[PDB]
Design an enzyme around this catalytic site. Structure first.
Site, PDB file in Angstrom:
ATOM      1  CG  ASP A  41      -2.004  -1.059   1.127  1.00 35.08           C
ATOM      2  OD1 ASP A  41      -2.237  -1.579   0.017  1.00 35.08           O
ATOM      3  OD2 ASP A  41      -2.616  -1.373   2.169  1.00 35.08           O
ATOM      4  CB  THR A  79      -3.319   5.001  -1.196  1.00 38.46           C
ATOM      5  OG1 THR A  79      -2.709   3.710  -1.073  1.00 38.46           O
ATOM      6  CG2 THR A  79      -4.634   5.004  -0.434  1.00 38.46           C
ATOM      7  CB  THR A  80      -0.101   2.924  -5.135  1.00 37.40           C
ATOM      8  OG1 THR A  80       0.182   2.231  -3.913  1.00 37.40           O
ATOM      9  CG2 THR A  80       1.149   2.949  -5.998  1.00 37.40           C
ATOM     10  CG  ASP A 102      -6.313  -1.615   1.094  1.00 45.91           C
ATOM     11  OD1 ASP A 102      -6.755  -0.950   2.055  1.00 45.91           O
ATOM     12  OD2 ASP A 102      -5.108  -1.620   0.767  1.00 45.91           O
TER      13      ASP A 102
END
Lengths: 44, 63, 48, 78, 96, 518, 74
Positions: free
Chosen positions: F57, F90-91, F384
């Site tokens: 993540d 999020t990446t 996630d």
């Protein structure tokens, strides 16, 4: 044939994976002497 | 040289004496040289005109 | 429950342990401890 | 004995780890260092020994039970 | 016939460390044992192994040496899952 | 004249800028290798306690790594905001926000464009990108069959980058059934994740009913058939008398012997009111003393103590009952029923297992791994995946992923860029090329040439076919409808919105004043 | 195993290719504003004797300013 397709960049992970294998095999060498009925105890 | 040491490290972990490893490389070194010596041919039969061509061939490789 | 398979497997599993020389009376000790709890459902045999 | 071994090469330990015959050689010297005391105290011809606490008091003990109890030995096999 | 097959050749040779270690700790030559291991295990389907008492290769069933299947099965499963986790690390960064 | 003081670092004009751009490149390059199913995991080693963590993540990587660059924390906060609202992508937010600055770095340099002019280019480009992405969405939940199949495709896409990618085929059903049993309520407090050492990753199975690790009483049997489950908010403990704030005044010990006996009869009468329900099982939030425990043996009542704050609501919803406090009125707080209360054992720690309950509103996930480094990621991998699947219940709009969504949004950007006069048109075209950087990295991490795959994908969409995408298995262009790659519209909208606003902030900084650290 | 001695700086990876290209950027940006008739002169602060030198030529500017980066020395 060369100069085409892609070229490998950021080769540090290739060295990081080698540094992780060498460091892991070094730990496996000390415990290797304790394998089998002929193994020896490890005093810590 | 490092390739010989990489293959020797695997043989040391198997319990082979290092001298036995060195004795095998010395005998295998003469077998490889004697094999390549028979494959090559003599170019000295050509005259000085063709002899200059062989000098241009090995020159571009080292450059 | 088999005295031949369980005892020989317990003494062999000791291997390099210091109790291998003492495994004569210790091998039936570990076997008889588990045989007191028997089930056909193959439970994990709690060691508590 | 001889020269000290290298410290954690590719091993990545924070302490000191020695391997080979050097461990068994130091284990014998650990038992031989504590034996030379008990040796001279064996038999009717043995002689007593005096242990000092550096506080001014002395302790005369013939047998190695209290001698090894008073003497501080930090060697693991000792 | 694939690059995955070339990896499996190293997977079989990687398991030879266990019988090799048994010979090194007992003082016997590893190659001399493995040479006898490959010949005897071809015809024999099982029970062929290294005996530490007789110092050689003999029948393990007659010597009563035995181990559960869960010990060897979990040893192969946990080893393959650990190598997968190590080979996925491309870098090591200092954190808080 | 130095007004600020001693040991005050400050950069102005060209010194201030390029500190945020390089700061974003250093942050963007860390998560660049973690993007895609072929991405590489990053190991984080703490400076103290010698604790290591393996995580894919991009949000958890930036939180652990200390960063003293003021502009680096901009990309760290947006990774947390993206993790808080959604939890996935999020990446991609950190990369997309960094690529906006890399393209804008050459706009001010090569083309000599004012930074505020570039901001006006992203405002017109993001408005057309969200309109093209919204029209490409497909309505969902109108059919219960298509709604369940779409959730399976989402779990396979999120877990593709996770270490679960090998076993994610079997895990698609694990994460899907947990959301359907929520009955429309979106919370992750109802989903439990237990770490277990041993076995293999694919050994993880779905839990029928609710499983929570507890222990039976000393004299209480393990297996009870058709047991009644009750949860009590109040704890069995020394209560003083009633209001606290008191102490006994004893003139003679003759009344003191019967005084302590009166306290023993108060808790005995409280259990008598509990026994009126006819329950075979009792659960308390806090530790139970040995004295009230003996009253449960003669009445055949199971006892569970030291219940976590989250375990109270997880167990109450599965059984269907509610937490009981006063116990006075038996008619209120009707209780459910559990078929099998028999406890099982996974590993060396026995786990209490329930089966055949009335409601599945709460769930439990059992995970098995070789090391805790895998178990730490196995919890965050499903966290996630379950977060997007939970948001899909309330938000039914979904779009095609796998590099296709970024290319469709870039198509509408270049269409409106030709009608925009002035120097701000160059900033509009830079936003389109920045969207093409995400599918470009997907090919780089997979070992395939990015120039060939992106060029074939870009020209195929302008022909009118919007279903084309990137296939990393065969290294060619394939249809996303056949491969089954579907992502929620809330996921892609949060990536474009957060990255466009984060890059706008750093372009507005002409000076950086760093005060002396404490 | 470290074959090199103490205080030996080496970059075998992306840090090397990044430092080589960025090292030439600071050199190119220094003489960038000196190109053309509208360019501006540069000031050189000497570390000894406090002798100031103002020259538009890029040869004197690069040789006077100390540069430890091998990419800059090229």
């Amino acid at each position: 044939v060369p100069s085409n397709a892609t070229f490998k960049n950021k080769e540090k992970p290739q060295e990081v994976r080698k540094a992780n294998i060498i460091a892991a095999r070094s730990v496996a060498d000390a415990i290797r002497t304790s394998l089998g009925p002929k193994g020896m105890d490890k005093m810590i | 040289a490092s390739a010989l040491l990489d293959q020797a490290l695997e043989l040391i972990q198997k319990g082979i004496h290092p001298i036995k490893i060195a004795n095998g490389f010395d005998e295998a070194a003469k077998l490889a040289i004697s094999k390549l010596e028979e494959t090559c041919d003599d170019i000295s039969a050509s005259n000085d005109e063709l002899f200059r061509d062989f000098l241009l061939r090995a020159a571009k490789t080292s450059l | 429950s088999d005295r031949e398979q369980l005892v020989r497997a317990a003494s062999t599993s000791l291997s390099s342990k210091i109790v291998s020389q003492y495994s004569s009376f210790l091998a039936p000790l570990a076997v008889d401890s588990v045989l007191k709890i028997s089930d056909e459902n193959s439970k994990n045999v709690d060691l508590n | 004995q001889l020269f000290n071994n290298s410290r954690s090469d590719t091993l990545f330990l924070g302490g000191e780890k020695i391997s080979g015959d050097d461990i068994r050689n130091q284990n014998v010297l650990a038992t031989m260092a504590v034996a030379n005391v008990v040796k001279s105290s064996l038999g009717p011809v043995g002689l007593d020994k005096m242990l000092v606490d550096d506080i001014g008091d002395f302790t005369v003990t013939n047998d190695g039970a209290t001698i090894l109890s008073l003497l501080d030995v930090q060697h693991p096999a000792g | 016939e694939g690059v995955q097959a070339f990896i499996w050749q190293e997977f079989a040779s990687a398991l030879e460390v266990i019988p090799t270690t048994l010979a090194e700790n007992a003082g016997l030559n590893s190659i001399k044992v493995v040479t006898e291991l490959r010949s005897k295990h071809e015809n024999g389907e099982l029970n062929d192994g290294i005996s530490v008492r007789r110092s050689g290769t003999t029948n393990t069933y007659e010597e009563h040496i035995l181990q559960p299947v869960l010990v060897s099965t979990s040893a192969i499963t946990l080893a393959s899952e650990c190598v997968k986790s190590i080979l996925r690390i491309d870098d090591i960064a200092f954190s808080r | 004249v130095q007004i600020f003081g001693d040991q005050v670092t400050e950069e102005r004009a060209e010194n201030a800028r390029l500190s945020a751009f390089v700061g974003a490149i250093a942050v963007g390059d860390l998560v660049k290798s973690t993007l895609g199913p072929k991405g590489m995991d990053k190991l984080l080693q703490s400076a103290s306690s010698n604790t290591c963590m393996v995580t894919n993540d991009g949000a958890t990587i930036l939180k652990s790594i200390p960063l003293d660059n003021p502009a680096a924390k901009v990309l760290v906060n947006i990774s947390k905001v993206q993790d808080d609202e959604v939890g996935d992508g999020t990446t991609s937010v950190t990369v997309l926000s960094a690529e906006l600055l890399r393209e804008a770095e050459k706009l001010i340099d090569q083309s000599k464009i004012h930074p505020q002019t570039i901001i006006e280019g992203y405002r017109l480009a993001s408005a057309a990108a969200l309109d093209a992405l919204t029209k490409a969405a497909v309505d969902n939940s109108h059919d219960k069959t298509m709604f369940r199949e779409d959730l399976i495709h989402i779990a396979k896409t999120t877990l593709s980058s996770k270490i679960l990618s090998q076993d994610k085929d079997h895990f698609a059903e694990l994460a899907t059934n947990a959301i359907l049993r929520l009955k429309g309520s979106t919370n992750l407090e109802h989903i439990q994740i237990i770490k277990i050492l041993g076995g293999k990753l694919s050994d993880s199975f779905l839990d029928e009913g609710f499983i929570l690790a507890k222990k039976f009483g000393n004299n209480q049997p393990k297996r009870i058939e058709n047991a009644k489950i009750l949860i009590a908010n109040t704890t069995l403990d020394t209560d003083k008398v009633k209001i606290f704030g008191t102490k006994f005044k004893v003139d003679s010990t003759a009344k003191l012997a019967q005084l302590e006996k009166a306290e023993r009869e108060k808790m005995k009468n409280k259990i008598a009111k509990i026994s009126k329900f006819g329950i075979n099982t009792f659960i308390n939030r806090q530790l139970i003393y040995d004295y009230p425990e003996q009253l449960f043996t003669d009445l055949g009542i199971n006892s569970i103590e030291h219940a976590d704050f989250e375990g109270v609501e997880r167990l109450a919803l599965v059984t269907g009952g509610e937490v009981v406090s006063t116990f006075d009125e038996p008619s209120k707080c009707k209780l459910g029923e559990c078929d099998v209360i028999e406890e099982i054992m996974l590993g060396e720690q026995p786990f209490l297992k329930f089966s055949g309950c009335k409601a599945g509103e709460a769930c439990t996930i059992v995970l098995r791994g070789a090391t805790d480094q895998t178990l730490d990621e196995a919890e965050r991998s499903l966290h996630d995946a379950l977060s997007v699947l939970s948001q899909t219940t309330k938000e039914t709009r979904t779009v095609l992923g796998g590099g296709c969504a970024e290319m469709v949004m870039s198509k509408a950007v270049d269409t409106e860029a030709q009608n925009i006069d002035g120097k701000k048109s160059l900033a509009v075209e830079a936003f389109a090329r920045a969207l093409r950087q995400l599918p470009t990295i997907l090919a780089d991490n997979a070992g395939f040439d990015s120039s060939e795959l992106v060029s074939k994908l870009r020209s195929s969409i302008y022909n009118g076919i919007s279903t084309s995408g990137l296939d990393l298995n065969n290294g060619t262009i394939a249809d996303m409808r056949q491969l089954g790659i579907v992502e929620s519209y809330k996921l892609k909208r949060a990536v474009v919105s957060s990255a466009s606003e984060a890059a706008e902030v750093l372009l507005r900084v002409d000076n950086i004043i760093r005060a002396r650290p404490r």
